[PDB]
Design a protein around this ligand. Sequence first.
Ligand SMILES: [Cl-]
Ligand SMILES: [Cl-]
Ligand SMILES: [K+]
Ligand code: NA
Length: 405
Amino acid sequence: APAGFQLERVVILSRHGVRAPTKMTQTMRDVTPHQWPEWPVKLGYITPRGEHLISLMGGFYRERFQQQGLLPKDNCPTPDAVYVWADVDQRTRKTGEAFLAGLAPQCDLAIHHQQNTQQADPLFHPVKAGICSMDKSQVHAAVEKQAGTPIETLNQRYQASLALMSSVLDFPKSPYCQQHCDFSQAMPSRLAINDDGNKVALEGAVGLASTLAEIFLLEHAQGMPKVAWGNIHTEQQWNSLLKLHNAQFDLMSRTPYIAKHNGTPLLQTIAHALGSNITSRPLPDISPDNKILFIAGHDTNIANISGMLGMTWTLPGQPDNTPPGGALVFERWVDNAGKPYVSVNMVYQTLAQLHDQAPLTLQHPAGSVRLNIPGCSDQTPDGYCPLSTFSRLVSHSVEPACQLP
Ligand SMILES: [Cl-]
Ligand SMILES: [Cl-]
Ligand SMILES: [K+]
Ligand code: NA
């Protein structure tokens, strides 16, 4: 950092770690003659390896923040300094615990989360929680705007990637094709919404391939002996398959109309934690002297925040834009005249770092991409957005109806 700059605190919005598939539907089984490999935990759970991998990130964060004077160079942080808010799911709660175990091994720290884990946390899922609702016609129009073309035509944008997915699956030899054969032709894209407008999905080949491609990446990150039945051989193939996943996320999570309805609570919380002079539902029991706020959520949350702030990225060595344990790290810096700024980085394990379970240290670091905020036209060439500007950008991107009551 520049002479005189001081790191005052950090807010980390992290995806959970490596998990088993959330579901394995009959369509997912039917589109390949091969058998999907069994995971060593319940569907949707983080695996012990996933936990380990998150702890490696915690250790990296410890080294980075110690070097910047934010945490002590040895022995436990004071507990007021570090706070975890995790979503209700096993995968997110255990990610929060694994982060603490890497950040502060054998320190007696515990996470926080919503008391009732059987209901949505409106910080992560305000629409499912009933805080606000989307208008179905507006969703359809906003997704088309984001795609730049009618959604029914989306497969035509991804012919090579869909053909590769077909070959990796051996789709033409699949029970699906014995009952219903070209992967793209068989499964045209369409946007499906429930009656209330609170459940939205991209149906068809791109949506399905997005899910499958992420499962292969997860298998790889889990160190399974057979990933995609041995059918992914090259970096180009990984990139081509994950292109479908990143596109699905751009459409279904980055699209600003959707992103602000799902992301308002989190963006307000993050901004407030960085020092924006706004009203935000307080996190229970958080200290005024908090230095590190770690929020354990989902890929969709990171994508929503990216859409609200107009941030886009590609991660060297990591084909998924929202990889397991990848996090947006928001840093509040002040210069020697006491002016506050926000920097934002995407910090992540490369595909190799996941697969190899690489130790992460300052000498052998996690990946990190410094982000441009396009609306922050005063952002410095070295990446610092004046907090006063960041605050105004947040204020214009949030949906007031979706603020936590
Ligand atoms: Cl289990
Ligand atoms: Cl495991
Ligand atoms: K900028
Ligand atoms: Na999945």
